[PDB]
Write a protein that binds this ligand. Structure first.
Ligand code: A52
Length: 190
């Protein structure tokens, strides 16, 4: 795997991924609801024209995050075995320099990895399900499947990924970690 940093657009969010090769397909970030950085990253107001599905029916991001934390406490083991809320803020994808929205969602566990993920709906079914429910971008970076039907999780050839294009998944993993290390923004990790 790898750890990588995403800068807040307006603070670094460290993610753990077993698919660093898919970085050019990371279209949003998800933090555990209990993640220490959430309160820091919560915007004062919603952006104009925000998708209502993203707001949990809250008037402000802070109210929505408080309500989400309170609501998920009413879940039992039954429910725990896709919902979430936009923080109103963005991080920068270090591969493409693009802003990506930051969410909390209870599908991300606080005490595992770094407690935060990069979301790649094209290639992780959990992220595909979330993106379909919320109306988030789904981008193909590994050719081999059909992202309109389901996340493609297998080996393939890199597309839409600049200096990774044409590489196999194993080659792209090595190349992107090299790039992250040269930039000081990530590391390979067991
Ligand atoms: C397992 C397939 O993962 C895939 C497959 C395709 C693409 C990806 C990933 B992967 O999601 C992260 C991390 O890598 C992966 C680490 O899981 P393992 O090995 O520790 O069991 O799980 C996800 N993960 C990491 N931390 C957490 C967490 N705290 N809570 C929930 N899921 C997490 O990154 C990309 C975008 N999602």
């Amino acid at each position: 795997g790898a750890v990588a940093l995403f800068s807040a657009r307006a603070v670094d969010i460290e993610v753990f991924t077993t698919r660093p090769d898919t970085l050019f397909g990371a279209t949003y970030l998800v933090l555990a609801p209990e993640h220490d950085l959430v309160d820091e990253l919560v915007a004062a107001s919603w952006p104009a024209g925000v998708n209502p599905l993203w707001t949990y029916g809250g008037g402000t991001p802070g109210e929505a995050i408080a309500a989400y934390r309170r609501a998920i406490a009413a879940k039992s083991d039954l429910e725990r075995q896709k919902t979430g809320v936009f923080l109103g803020s963005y991080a920068i994808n270090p591969a493409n320099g693009e802003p990506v929205p930051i969410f909390i969602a209870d599908y991300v566990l606080a005490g595992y990895g770094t407690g935060a993920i990069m979301a790649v709906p094209g290639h992780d079914q959990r992220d595909w399900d979330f993106a379909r429910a919320f109306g988030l971008p789904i981008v193909e970076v590994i050719a081999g499947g059909n992202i309109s039907e389901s996340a493609y999780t297998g080996d393939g050839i890199l597309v839409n990924s600049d200096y990774l294009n044409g590489m196999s998944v194993p080659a792209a993993k090595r190349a992107i970690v090299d790039r992250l290390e040269s930039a000081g923004r990530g590391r390979a990790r067991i």
